[PDB]
């Protein structure tokens, strides 16, 4: 089932007329001064045995080179992102020799049967609160929430409630409320969500403390924090 | 009393002019090449026990501007060097200041002696940094 | 005796107001044929670009002066001084504290920030050469 | 399809295209600012001027704009005509009258489209001696810095942000030579696709703030073709490194998937690579003490204990590569290999795989999404997870205006005519979520309900 | 203009080639070389070549022979399909015209017939083409490596070969020990040349250091390549502007003479005509360096074959010339002062008084030199008939300069093909009486030194007014005072020193009269900001190739005198 990955990119013996594909622009600077504060003797250039690319500027990045993997776009007289026009067949089209990437599976000749597993209609329960998942572009992903520039772009941790359910609980916007998941206790400030239906509880998925496995789970206890 | 064997070759020995088994000093100048490097290694071997080597110029200190397939990147790769004199080409006064910087090593002895840790970068620092005004370059 | 245009030791100069003249634009590093300049841009809270570190490998340098003529601030200049010599090649690597001198060198009066549109302390918008005052879009005058 | 005559030579081009996108495909360099391949032609900057003749014998013609001129069969144009060249130089000269002296301290320097076109026209001598107009700046949030003095009024930013990306908080203000591009007041740009403005703006007005902390020029970068790791869409990227740290994230063109645009999580979420807390050497514990090992020591130390163990299991990850999971699977055996995701998340993923492989329904690429005529979104808050699909779905909803304009014989590149014909007519889009989504401004109906009700 | 692209179809050599081989047997390329360029097939190379050798005003000299890779050349409109190419530059003195023949090759079949039978100077050129590219010349007697050592795998001017030393593994001395052992066991396998042979094989190594294997003179074989710096390869990894320092180091005595053909060739690709003040300034610096080189040749010539006590005063005069050069340019040697479109700065305001002091100072010394060398008998007796050659030997081996002019062939480049405004000056071309030897060559140089001082007299009194840089968008860099104040000038300066100036796809070619012989630059642009191919023709390579033909029948002392008389430097030879 993973046989297509061989054709996704060429191997480390692929050459453009004997040249390896370059990683650095041809005007790359500081070769004899970058590492000169540790040792004045220039080290050897890193050697890549895994891929067709070289850890240097001594290689090829021609717009008309027969390849699909283009590390960066540059042309004579076009130093900006507008240099991608030289690498396409028609401007705004596909890359000249084809876009990189291959589809592992093609469309099957025959389809499936109809799924007859229709769920019953949702009903709220006293005590149990369904966890409605809320996702954020700048908080829900594991690696990128550890970026320091994302700390201010992500919102404050909250807990979203229907107005009728917050009226039954007795809270308003901003009140810190406590709940129990799996024997643990987390306290969060309440936010009010009119479009959220009653019996549900909005949590931000993938944050520091709220795992995405919690989607579709249940909160047994919910009360004002003291 | 220092006896100099000058192996200056091209475009770096023209300043030296303006400035076997008998020498104790080898003043390597010029570009050191991959093809001719055994010649300098045998001439270094021929000399007697108390050797001193002065590298002058960027082509002998490093490869200089010739970071190219046919040039070795410095004479210090294969022979020990004592003094380095930057420039392309250096000056006769620099050659004089090299012999003056080397007699201090000849009179200071493992010849570091914990006194050669002081460097001209730090020693002439308060001289060079206090400079404010320089002559305008539209005049002779 | 040396002429004024002599190509010896490379220094970094200062403004007549006393700040370092280098704005870490990296044009001197790229224009060098030997690749003997490394630097990184830093920025003050005032907003002034300046080099975090400036490193010249004088073992490699050929004193061609292409760095001086590349510089759009007159910060890097070549001085009449050939007196250099060291026991170690590692001591031919000069940092910014070995290169930054106390005055403006060959060009006593040029300040780049007075030309530049970018706003730093002492020069808000419209306080540069041949620059008018900013007009807001909400202004009553058509 | 069509044949045109350019500067005496003869070429074969597509008739539906305009003259700028025809001639740029043939390798004929015409300067331009306001045109974009994604955004279409509006005709504002007047930089793309060519001389057009009526036939082969007409010696004195007229200056037209090649972005606004169709490449019909029988077209006679001259890029290198002297009057066209002088006018194109004058357009650069008029833009240079109010431009600040900022290239050493501009982050667009060396990667600036205005710098390239100024050289390409061959305008190097200043005649203007009067004062320059200045603007104050806005705060646009933690990602994008603002410098309005560098603006050339090409209108690419507003055409991308409002028309293409359907953002609401960027507009043009003022009139005549005092036009101001920005927000009504300071604050964060609300769009999830705000960061494409750094590539879309041909000057240094909108620049990457995350890159200006550790800035380096483009020629000092080391680039590799890479894939975004922040979600499942697979946008092609070109990460750049200097001095051992990842510096910026650039869009890598792929005409099948992402083309010119990335999302903000992909563009700005790279900072975890540059953390000081990452392990750089193998580390072995000894009670409370920690021992640092090299690669050879770590392998010999680990396999001594692994030989003495009676059963070794392996836990993979969805954020690890295919070669990394397989190698883990090869080390413990396939009977001892676990995926690392929960059982309920595993059950939804293999059912999602089953309908793609065995459903018999084609699954479109990210750019093929923009050709569809109706979209039903069930449960997936797609702007927050898979954000480039939401950008692709907005373009699909605009297909209704393209169909009406085609019936009235308006060309595909004349975007302001197509938008005028449309007048809020949309292809139908029906989204279901537990709350409101960011696709609600263009959706025909929104259904807020629990997941069983969806 | 003198830079516009021409096919040279009105040259009379093409019409007689049409009437001899037909219209379908070649293909004409439109260049900016100034000469016709014709693509011929390799099966017709010898027929076309020997046809030009017996034209009624024949092409007598093979100027250059080298190769191009051409595999990564994207702009190839009009050319035949080539994977490699070999060019042949031929010169007719009687027509004052040149022709270039280009042979196209495929990557599997790098084979072309040798040109050595027609023109003897082609032997070293084909060995270099075999060394640096992988073209095999069929019929070559000793086709071995002339630049790199004999165990060097790889052809360094191929485009798949990495240029930089850092890209290879450093000097770990694994190969230094093996090369040392090989050099220690210096023995003759009878492969180092013809080597027919009782016979004592001796290696003698002496203004440059090189080895020669001599048979004791029955046979002598120069071994060169000890000073190879990869200058031609360096042109591919440097921009057009940042390559300029490397030009100054092809010849150490040349200085600004060496920069002149390169900047003139780049200005043809740029389409720049320079102002008159640029022409007079460039001619001034080139005649100053020419005087310095000629005084060095006359000085060193008098020291080896005579008493060196009076002529040591010439060091003070060379010190005055170096002080005047570093007053104008900045630095005594390797100025790197010529720019694309002009020079680096204007002349400083006190230049006239120093040049006037040098022009007043020089005639007394010059007339003492004429007395010291023209009237002497001992050096004249040791320099007359010492390895002499004539006009037939000069034109065979591509010998130019004082050598060629010492025979009856009056051929200067400054009069035949004027460059840099040399045609607006009043100077004479000295010439010998048909025999080129050691006395005649030195006497010619004394006459040339006086003519150079006449050119400097006209430069001081007719120095015109105006810019030191052309007004053109490819003038690199722009004037700095405009760069420091004006944004469009700053934008042009920003991209020119960083990415580089964009030269459009063409081929240019310039020849200048150098301090020693004729130096040329053949530059190819593929439309980028770096050169695709840079070819440097140095006359010393031909002059050093000519010595085994003339020294055969002489002593070792005659070899030392002949080597001291010829105008050769090993930096020129190996580049
Ligand atoms: S250091 Fe400079 S002057 Fe000396 S040999 Fe090398 S290039 Fe020539
Ligand atoms: S020295 Fe000049 S060119 Fe170099 S970084 Fe500083 S301002 Fe830029
Ligand atoms: S003088 Fe030349 S070699 Fe030295 S740092 Fe400046 S550009 Fe580099
Ligand atoms: S936007 Fe471009 S032209 Fe304007 S200052 Fe920045 S780099 Fe220079
Ligand atoms: S801000 Fe940038 S994209 Fe917008 S109009 Fe100005 S120059 Fe064009
Ligand atoms: S949609 Fe955004 S996060 Fe997902 S792959 Fe593309 S750029 Fe990365
Ligand atoms: S690009 Fe055509 S008018 Fe602006």
Numbering used by the authors:
A (entry chain G): 682 to 907
B (entry chain B): 53 to 71, 90 to 179, 190 to 220
C (entry chain I): 39 to 180
D (entry chain G): 1 to 454
E (entry chain D): 9 to 205, 210 to 218, 224 to 233, 238 to 596
Q: What's the publication's text?
A:
Respiratory complex I is a multi-subunit membrane protein complex that reversibly couples NADH oxidation and ubiquinone reduction with proton translocation against transmembrane potential. Complex I from all characterized species contains homologues of 14 core subunits; seven subunits each assemble into peripheral and membrane arms, joined at their tips and form the complex with a characteristic L-shape. The peripheral arm, exposed to the cytoplasm in bacteria or the mitochondrial matrix in eukaryotes, contains binding sites for NADH, ubiquinone, and flavin mononucleotide (FMN) as well as eight or nine iron-sulfur clusters, seven of which connect the NADH and ubiquinone-binding sites enabling rapid electron transfer. Here, we describe the single particle cryo-electron microscopy (cryo-EM) structure of the entire catalytically active E. coli complex I reconstituted into lipid nanodiscs.
Micrograph analysis, in contrast to mass photometry, revealed that large fraction of the particles corresponds to the peripheral arm only that may have dissociated during cryo-EM sample preparation. These yielded 3D reconstruction to 2.8 Å resolution, similar to the map of the peripheral arm of intact complex I. Joining two subsets and applying density modification improved resolution of the peripheral arm to 2.1 Å. At an average resolution of 2.1 Å with the local resolution in the core reaching 2.0 Å conformations of most side chains in the peripheral arm, positions of ions, and multiple water molecules were resolved unambiguously. The relative positions of all redox centers with FMN and nine iron-sulfur clusters, including off path cluster N7, are particularly well conserved. A distinctive feature of the E. coli peripheral arm is the presence of ordered C-terminal extensions in subunits NuoB, NuoI, and NuoF with a length of 22–45 residues and a large 94 residue insertion loop in subunit NuoG, referred to as the G-loop. Similarly, the G-loop fills a crevice between NuoCD, NuoI, and NuoG subunits and together with the extensions increase the interaction surface between the electron acceptor module (NuoEFG) and connecting module (NuoICDB) by a factor of three (from 1400 to 4600 Å2), thus stabilizing the peripheral arm assembly. A strong density near the NuoG surface coordinated by GAsp617, GGln632, GGlu647, GAsp731 and four water molecules was assigned to a Ca2+ ion. Divalent ions are known to increase both the activity and stability of E. coli complex I. One of the calcium ligands, GAsp731, is part of the G-loop, suggesting that Ca2+ stabilizes the fold of the G-loop and consequently, the peripheral arm. At 2.1 Å resolution, 1170 water molecules associated with the peripheral arm were modeled. In E. coli complex I, cluster N1a can be reduced by NADH due to its uniquely high potential (~ −0.3 V), differentiating it from other characterized species in which N1a cannot be reduced by NADH.
